[PDB]
Nucleic acid binder design. Structure first.
Ligand SMILES: [Fe+2]
Ligand SMILES: [O-]
Ligand SMILES: [Zn+2]
Length: 349
RNA sequence: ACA
């Protein structure tokens, strides 16, 4: 029994073209797509006003296709899980920093998170690395003065994700830019013949944040995009795969993984516990996280009986199943934070 | 389409 998982590189607002090429895969091969994974640059602009938050050169200031799906004029045929890249409607993703559906069958994993589906544990890391913004907190509500910084990966995601491989392994991990140094772990001489600009960066190419997470979690697969080219490498037990952008080949590949059981999209229990136990660092809605707290220290308070109480309370107020919510993203920001605060306060710690 |  096999599940077929589609992995997609940069979309850049060409959703109808992506789904057309996914639909033709099913009709030409006869295989069924379980769900779709996207590595970022989604450009989930609801309407014209969201163009302010799209940090791209002037020639790429385009609405794209997402608004057709947001308005219900188009319907995504497959469940699509994605992270954020550097070309995003960054205000939308900040409202959904704890993850959420931007529209039917399109689920944003948030700034970072782990999810469950078909017996798999999938980790996502949004954004691209810039050293001068890795210590910067998020300010809320989103402001046009932060269009240049909202998509930069923060350092604190390392401490948020480092313990996720204690109970069981991670099957798939998602990042937009490559883990730093991974370029040297494949056929880099061939990559340089096709992308001569990558050679000057050497082993420093990519994100050091994603390098640390890869070495810590060591998932079965690490999938990245951003660089608009095909690449594959092996970092110990981890299969690295990079994908191009929609409109060109090597933008979509397919993982054929064993299917232990078919299961709906669910929150990862270990991630849910991390989310609740770090609430004090995120309790100030106007600026988070407050790194006067130590994320590691907050997470060191996890116990077996506390984790059991959190899942019981999470299932009560939110539920283990990740279900579609059509409230406006500012309402979902407040709603999800309301129940994280409520669960934490009922733990009495 | 890093900036
Ligand atoms: Fe990108
Ligand atoms: O990209
Ligand atoms: Zn791209």
């Amino acid at each position: 029994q096999i599940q077929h998982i589609a992995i997609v590189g940069c979309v850049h607002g060409k959703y109808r073209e992506m789904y057309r090429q996914l639909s033709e895969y099913e009709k030409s091969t006869g295989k069924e797509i379980s769900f779709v994974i996207c590595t970022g640059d989604m450009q989930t602009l609801r309407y014209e006003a969201d163009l302010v938050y799209l940090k791209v050169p002037p020639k790429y200031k385009q609405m794209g296709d997402f608004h057709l799906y947001y308005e219900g004029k188009e319907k995504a045929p497959y469940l699509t899980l994605f992270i954020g890249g550097n070309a995003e409607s960054s205000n939308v993703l900040l409202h959904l920093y704890n993850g959420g559906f931007v529209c039917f069958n399109m689920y944003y994993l948030g700034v970072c998170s782990c999810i469950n589906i078909n017996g798999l544990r999938i980790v996502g890391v949004s954004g691209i690395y810039k050293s001068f913004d890795e210590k910067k907190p998020y300010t809320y509500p989103p402001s046009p003065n932060d269009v240049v910084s909202l998509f930069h990966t923060r350092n604190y995601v390392i401490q948020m994700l480092s313990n996720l491989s204690q109970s069981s392994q991670i099957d798939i991990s998602l990042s937009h830019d490559w883990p730093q140094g991974i370029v040297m772990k494949g056929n880099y001489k061939q990559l340089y013949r096709f992308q001569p600009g990558f050679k000057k960066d050497g082993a420093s190419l990519g994100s050091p944040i994603n390098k640390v997470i890869l070495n810590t979690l060591k998932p079965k697969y690490w999938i990245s995009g951003h660089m608009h080219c095909e690449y594959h490498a092996e970092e110990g037990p981890t299969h690295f795969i990079a994908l191009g952008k929609i409109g060109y080949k090597n933008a979509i590949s397919y993982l054929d993984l064993p299917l232990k059981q078919k299961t709906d999209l669910e929150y990862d229990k270990d991630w849910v516990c991390n989310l609740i136990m770090t609430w004090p660092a995120f309790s100030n809605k106007a600026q988070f996280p407050d790194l006067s707290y130590s994320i590691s220290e907050l997470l060191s308070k996890r116990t077996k009986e506390l984790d059991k109480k959190i899942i019981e309370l999470w299932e009560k107020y939110i539920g283990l199943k990740i279900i579609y919510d059509s409230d406006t993203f500012d309402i979902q920001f407040t709603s999800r934070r309301f129940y994280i605060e409520k669960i934490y306060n009922e733990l009495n710690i």
